[PDB]
């Protein structure tokens, strides 16, 4: 839904979970579960292996999602030095630097955090 998300093509997905080595036919419970695939690198994971909530699972499938290592800030479009401190939205899993949010954040939020895209919807 963001301009660069609609614009940028997506990598060929690798049909194996990077965490359990399972497939869409077998997760860690040996049950079927569709994979989520990174649009940048193509690596995949089961939502259960990613420890996603049901909301994250249903929302990221429709978005140009990036894995933990590919994730770039949705404002400044960079990974940055403090990439470890990039926040992940608890609704859409997009990443934001604290300084790149609106309003900018100086202290790490407690509890659930919803990004500026998801708060009005």
């Amino acid at each position: 839904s963001l301009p660069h998300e609609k614009d940028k093509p997506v990598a060929e997905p690798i049909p194996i979970c990077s965490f359990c080595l399972g497939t869409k036919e077998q997760n860690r419970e040996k049950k079927p579960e569709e994979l989520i695939s990174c649009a940048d690198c193509g690596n995949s994971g089961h939502p259960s292996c990613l420890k996603f909530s049901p909301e994250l699972t249903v929302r990221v499938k429709a978005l140009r999602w990036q894995c933990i290592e590919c994730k770039t800030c949705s404002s400044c479009r960079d990974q940055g030095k403090n990439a470890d401190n990039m926040l992940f939205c608890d609704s859409c899993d997009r990443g934001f630097h604290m300084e790149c949010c609106d309003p900018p954040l100086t202290r790490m939020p407690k509890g659930m955090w919803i990004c500026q895209i998801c708060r009005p919807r």
């Binding site: 194996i16 965490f19 080595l21 933990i68 992940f88």
Partner: peptide, 25 residues
Amino acid sequence: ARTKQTARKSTGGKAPRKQLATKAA
């Protein structure tokens, strides 16, 4: 809130890359 760091820790880390490639083949 979650960060790239907490997310990394939460998953427990990737399986070995070589083992992933053996399965893909």
